[PDB]
């Protein structure tokens, strides 16, 4: 399947690790040019990405400092000539529960998780409308299902769903598609490092994984990436406003399902 | 139908006008005790709520100053002895489009529209858990459907839908119900006045209303209030995590309906 | 709260037991007139309903014989002068799994569970349109979430959700509201008797109920009926096309939700 | 992007024309072997699929005669050695409105549109379980949003959404994925001929198409096929229970959206 993204430029926030890095590698393997906005870039990931795409660039930035975004996006546009797509992906489930988290710390969380989805989109939109491209927001099942001990993250992810539908409305006229991916549980090195923090790592993974209908296993990075990159590409050219769930049946299948 | 809310205390933010005021009246006429947090209270609304409920109170506050909330919720709880329910309703569709609104102005909208939903709920939760009460977030169609030129309002309303599900999860163990109402188009005095600014106020109303399948007309305040007050009451004792749409079919029915 | 349904006629299929009966009692208790279409009517239920409404009627019918519905609906209309509302409620989870149920037996399931939602609505529509009334479909969580061993019941319940949206579209211009209620687990006498057949009825109840976030307990019949009758009443006069879930958080809340 | 479907066998019902034929061509173009169950096969299509896959086969069947399905599916499994995927696609919007369609004609519509989704899945399941493959139901926007003059089609497509969730629950343990595609308006040669019968076919097209936010234009067959074949493929190996909308924003975007 020819995704027709060769030499198309995609900025991926938090594209240095985990899900965002999976999306970047697949974008690169398919001939697109990925540009990573993230706090740091592991040297080995930088090497793999350069090997995949000679035009790849890393821009070091903490996106809580959203005033830096206009200057950085402008550089990207000058260096490469335009921007086709944006993946808003940088975020952290910081498990801030309402009963013990101040409103001030909620706002701090929105700085780390939410505001730059707006700012990145705002500054990329001039260029993405030119190329009739794509915006993709990585949200989370928690914005839909809740979880119970993570008010700051749940509302930020739901807000990003609202942004998805709002921007799909705003730029349908422009042939710019806006979609979101809501993963449930995706195995990343950070996740594995968080499980290994447990007295019984296997038991703890099993507690989570047994609630996932398709295989009692976490979604892989590659599985999120495949759906993300397909959705970004011209091959999804009538898909917009979609909250997509490659999630093993987590959100939609009977909660009592077991085997 | 006996709603079983005689003397139950409900705080209603933005409850001085429009939708929230309709909820306060109904809450009161069914025997509940409404407590209004809002920027100001029209004299005539203050007189009407006092006739409906001798224990009703108005607390003047701009909820962008969310640090005032802890003190005010503690006062309510000391005066009446507790709090059964909270309606987070204060908000403004401020039509802030992403392409011409700064990120600083996005955050100012969230001060006006979003953060106090969290803070109000935070400070009421100890009392509402005590009474195994109800929290109701008034959200908006736009958080689900989008609109096109109101990025700050759509994300905030969608965020409030996430709060609704998150809190329903957090407090199911406590027998606290958390739901939302997503109105589409609701006729208020202030909506009527915005329409009246138009050279042709009727044409502008009809332009909007024709999109509404059930009757080509706006939802009334009473219609939002009936569903809100029923949903808050003990008669909806197994309803939680719901986003309710008393919206004339706006969100769900074929867009091409005519 | 005044629901404004005094002397309004509502036909409730399967109104003789379970959820439908709880809906019939509340309708009558709030001043409405319930008309029950069901296979049989327990004597003690006929007595309670008669005490709640002097004009309540029972019509004995098995709704797989959908050709009988036109004549039955016509007699109701002549007797009472009209019909304000219809509750399509009669149905059975027959646990017909695709891998060992024939297509023929799927169709028989639809005769029992599905076709009469259409025929009842068809024959009631002329009267409900005259009174700008209300149609309510009792569906199921399984139509949305699936279950795994009940193909016939899940597709029938999902079909009824499509009927709900389609008829809400069709009759919005007539000011006829059409909605649905999707219960999850509702404690009925038949549910309790089903549980009492297990080696350990309490432990089987708790196995099912543990998955219900709000109170680890079944929804009650009253809880369903309250949301039903409110939604039918003129007080929900801008509510249509809705699939309502008074279900304890079953459909929408995080599947991993866990509290002791 | 390597879909990893080389030599995988997919049966596509109604795959002779329109959406199903676009899915068949792309399946073959990506190395899969398509098998079409349909009423008839245009010569020009049989030639194009034969050119694309030397193992492609057509089986003439009117899927209302669902008893024929077992023998046909068994023939496919012997000939090709197995079946990896099934696309349930055959169907017709017959615009049967409740107020002038009998229950008997509703049931006839289900024979044309619904029952064979069940029978095809039932008979294909042993083979698809063996290959841990995929089932894809083509449904319709109308099963979600209603339309207003087509009760039989809206309920059938909603029932297929129920089947999608129910089968996804039933076979997750077997690593069998079950999803659905809900198109809104898709331009097919048959849709174009239908538009051409109008006094002003361009005006009628634009009346329908102006409600589609993304581009004021119908979805293409290619657009449906691409999402279909990706979702069927092993590259969507954690996607199940999904109702997917490649529909230009038809279902989810603000009904009042208006530009130019
Ligand atoms: N993994 C899951 O199970 C799961 C489930 C649902 C949703 N998600 C979503 O997936 C997205 C990516 O998460 P992940 O699981 O891939 O986590 P991850 O492995 O920690 O990767 C996140 C990346 O984003 C970067 N980042 C985060 N916040 C940033 C900020 N304010 N400025 C700059 N860089 C930032 C991180 O940088 P450093 O680590 O170097 O600071 C890291 O490179 C998130 O939006 C999350 O909501 C993940
Ligand atoms: N009306 C509709 O068609 C519609 C549609 C969808 C959603 N909604 C939702 O309904 C809710 C109420 O809207 P409405 O139409 O009833 O508006 P409204 O008639 O203008 O009333 C809003 C009330 O909230 C108050 N308020 C707003 N922000 C506040 C703040 N930061 N602090 C204190 N008070 C504040 C206003 O006070 P002042 O005016 O005195 O400042 C006013 O009393 C909103 O959350 C909105 O999202 C309404
Ligand atoms: N209870 C739950 O947990 C639950 C959960 C989700 C959805 N629901 C839905 O709620 C509705 C009512 O179920 P329920 O739990 O109240 O069941 P129930 O206690 O068995 O009551 C059903 C009533 O409907 C009657 N009935 C069923 N099929 C009929 C037919 N073809 N013709 C005439 N009468 C018929 C039954 O009569 P006989 O018993 O005399 O045959 C019985 O009186 C059903 O549509 C079901 O799908 C229930
Ligand atoms: N096109 C749209 O705008 C649209 C929108 C939403 C959903 N859909 C869905 O997409 C699917 C395909 O429709 P389409 O638009 O591609 O229609 P189409 O162009 O008419 O193609 C339908 C194909 O299926 C065949 N077929 C239908 N019923 C059959 C039966 N009982 N037995 C055997 N073959 C049968 C037809 O055969 P003959 O024509 O030779 O009889 C034809 O080859 C349908 O399930 C429909 O619900 C389409
Ligand atoms: Mg920085
Ligand atoms: Mg103040
Ligand atoms: Mg009979
Ligand atoms: Mg045949």
Residue numbers in the entry:
A (entry chain D): 1 to 259
B (entry chain A): 1 to 258
C (entry chain B), D (entry chain C): 1 to 260
Give sentences copied directly from the paper behind this entry.
Several aldose sugars in both d- and l-configurations were screened as substrates and Cj0485 displayed substantial activity on l-fucose and d-arabinose and with low levels of activity on l-galactose. The holo-enzyme’s asymmetric unit contained four monomers that were arranged as tetramers with identical D2 symmetry to the crystallographic tetramer observed in the apo-complex. PISA31 analysis predicts this recurring tetramer to be a stable conformation, supporting the likelihood that the tetramer is the biologically relevant assembly of the enzyme.
The holo-enzyme in complex with NADP+ also crystallized in the space group P1. Kinetic analysis of Cj0485 activity using an excess of l-fucose as a substrate revealed a preference for NADP+ as a cofactor with KM, kcat, and kcat/KM values of 9.9 ± 1.9 μM, 16.5 ± 0.7 s−1 and 1.7 ± 0.3 μM−1 s−1, respectively compared with KM, kcat, and kcat/KM values of 6050 ± 1080 μM, 20.5 ± 2.1 s−1 and 0.0034 ± 0.0008 μM−1 s−1, respectively, for NAD+. Though we attempted extensive co-crystallization and soaking experiments, we were unable to obtain a ternary complex of Cj0485, NADP+ and l-fucose. However, comparison of our NADP+ complex to the ternary complex of FabG revealed insight into substrate specificity. Despite only 45% amino acid sequence identity, the NADP+ and l-fucose binding sites are comprised of identical amino acid side chains, pointing to indistinguishable modes of substrate accommodation and consistent with the matching specificities of the two enzymes. The only notable difference, likely owing to the lack of bound fucose in Cj0485, was the more open conformation of the catalytic site in Cj0485 whereby an α-helical “lid” enclosing the l-fucose binding site was retracted by ~5.8 Å relative to its conformation in FabG. The apparent selectivity of these enzymes for β-l-fucose may result from van der Waals interactions between the enzyme active site and the C6 methyl group of this sugar, leading to a higher binding affinity compared with d-arabinose, which lacks the C6 methyl group.
